[PDB]
Amino acid sequence: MNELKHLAVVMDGNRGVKTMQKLMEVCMEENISNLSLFAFSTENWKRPKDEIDFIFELLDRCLDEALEKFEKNNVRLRAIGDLSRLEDKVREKITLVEEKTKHCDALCVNLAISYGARDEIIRAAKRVIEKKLELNEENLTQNLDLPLDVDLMLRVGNAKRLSNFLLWQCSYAEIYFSETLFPSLTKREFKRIIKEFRNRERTFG
Amino acid sequence: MNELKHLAVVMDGNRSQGVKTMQKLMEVCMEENISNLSLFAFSTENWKRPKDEIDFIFELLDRCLDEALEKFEKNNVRLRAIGDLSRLEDKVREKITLVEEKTKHCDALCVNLAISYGARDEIIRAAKRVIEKKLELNEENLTQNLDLPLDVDLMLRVGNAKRLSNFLLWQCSYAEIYFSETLFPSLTKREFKRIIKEFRNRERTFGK
Numbered sequence: 216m217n218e219l220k221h222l223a224v225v226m227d228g229n230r231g232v233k234t235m236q237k238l239m240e241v242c243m244e245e246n247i248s249n250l251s252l253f254a255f256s257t258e259n260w261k262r263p264k265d266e267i268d269f270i271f272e273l274l275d276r277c278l279d280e281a282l283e284k285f286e287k288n289n290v291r292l293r294a295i296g297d298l299s300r301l302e303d304k305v306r307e308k309i310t311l312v313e314e315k316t317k318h319c320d321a322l323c324v325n326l327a328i329s330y331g332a333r334d335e336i337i338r339a340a341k342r343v344i345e346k347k348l349e350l351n352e353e354n355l356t357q358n359l360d361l362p363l364d365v366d367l368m369l370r371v372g373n374a375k376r377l378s379n380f381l382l383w384q385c386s387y388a389e390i391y392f393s394e395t396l397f398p399s400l401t402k403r404e405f406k407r408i409i410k411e412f413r414n415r416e417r418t419f420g
Numbered sequence: 421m422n423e424l425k426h427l428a429v430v431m432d433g434n435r436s437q438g439v440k441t442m443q444k445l446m447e448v449c450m451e452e453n454i455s456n457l458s459l460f461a462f463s464t465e466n467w468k469r470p471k472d473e474i475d476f477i478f479e480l481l482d483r484c485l486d487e488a489l490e491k492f493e494k495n496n497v498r499l500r501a502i503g504d505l506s507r508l509e510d511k512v513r514e515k516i517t518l519v520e521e522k523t524k525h526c527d528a529l530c531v532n533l534a535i536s537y538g539a540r541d542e543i544i545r546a547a548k549r550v551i552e553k554k555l556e557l558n559e560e561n562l563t564q565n566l567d568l569p570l571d572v573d574l575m576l577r578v579g580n581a582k583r584l585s586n587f588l589l590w591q592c593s594y595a596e597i598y599f600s601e602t603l604f605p606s607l608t609k610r611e612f613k614r615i616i617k618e619f620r621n622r623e624r625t626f627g628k
């Protein structure tokens with residue numbers, strides 16, 4: 216009854232991968248076209264520099280994994296965010312992996328890096344201005360990094376909040392708080408959560 | 421530890437005491453030093469509801485506006501309307517303005533009433549105000565030009581719906597979110613207070 220075209224997942228940000236593949240594998244069996252993930256926020260730039268270099272160290276390992284395995288598995292990678300804040304090293308690797316995988320049909324992984332929803336909205340507003348378009352919901356929407364509405368917004372962890380992730384896109388997103396101390400989760404419980412989603416009533420106001 | 425300046429509330433919009441429970445929420449806000457209480461009455465999308473449903477909602481809203489004309493200023497509660505008010509019938513707009521004017525000076529609690537309101541629309545309207553003022557289009561400027569500039573600390577959903585439904589999206593970027601599965605009527609002061617206590621002890625990093 217409900218179509219899940221766009222699934223957005225965020226995991227706890229408190230000061231492993233299996234869950235991520237299980238994640239991607241399921242979006243696929245389920246015919247979920249867009250998977251959106253939150254890696255690094257605009258506000259995260261204020262963290263302690265140690266915590267940051269550590270996160271980009273992880274990120275870098277993730278991107279390497281993307282290059283190797285994304286194309287042959289027919290997965291696409293797209294980076295959203297204010298990417299200009301990023302070091303050239305990462306930025307290049309990103310650009311590369313996007314280009315390598317640009318032609319993948321089976322799933323689209325939207326990776327949010329140096330990303331914030333308020334920044335996105337501001338940037339989108341400007342895109343609109345510089346095209347000499349009327350400022351309205353529709354033109355703004357179409358000029359986001361990610362125009363696509365979120366259907367299911369999924370928090371893997373104990374934090375109850377959006378933390379500046381795809382706000383605009385979430386106006387009518389179904390929200391789901393899946394508690395854990397460990398960003399863990401099972402193929403089935405995903406499918407469980409999904410099932411739940413398809414059945415719950417969406418009125419879009 | 422966490423301070424709660426701005427409480428937002430939305431109840432399930434699908435399928436008396438209500439007035440009594442509301443007083444308790446308002447008393448709890450005062451007792452707790454919550455300066456702002458934000459309520460969701462009618463949204464921009466709600467306009468696509470059957471005409472009979474819209475009719476009934478404005479019928480009640482009217483009833484509530486009257487209560488507020490009666491009870492608000494003598495309790496030092498301020499009322500503010502947000503949303504695109506230009507979409508409202510004349511009789512309504514004026515009656516809103518009336519209670520607004522009458523309670524404009526009220527110090528103790530500020531009740532923000534979202535009527536013909538949508539977050540996306542609020543956001544667009546804020547961007548035009550910034551442009552119209554020849555300000556730079558940035559986060560801070562857009563914030564300050566919202567109908568309601570104040571960040572939401574706690575977003576409380578009363579009902580079974582799990583979603584924000586175009587309610588104060590910008591303000592909620594880092595808002596703590598809480599789903600209480602009950603009807604509004606069934607809520608007690610003790611419960612409001614508890615939920616509040618819970619929010620106060622939650623870890624808020626704002627991205628660190």
Ligand SMILES: CC(C)=CCC/C(C)=C\CC/C(C)=C\COP(=O)(O)O
Nearest residue numbers: 226227228254255256273274374378
């Ligand atoms: C591995 C990698 C590149 C990034 C790790 C991202 C993870 C697992 C969580 C970060 C989530 C973000 C950006 C915000 C969530 O904020 P919160 O949990 O609500 O404080």
Ligand SMILES: CC(C)=CCC/C(C)=C\CC/C(C)=C\COP(=O)(O)O
Nearest residue numbers: 431432433460461462463481581585
């Ligand atoms: C009594 C009165 C004047 C208005 C009542 C507002 C109520 C009870 C529900 C409407 C809430 C709104 C505007 C949106 C929530 O929609 P949803 O529950 O997410 O489908």
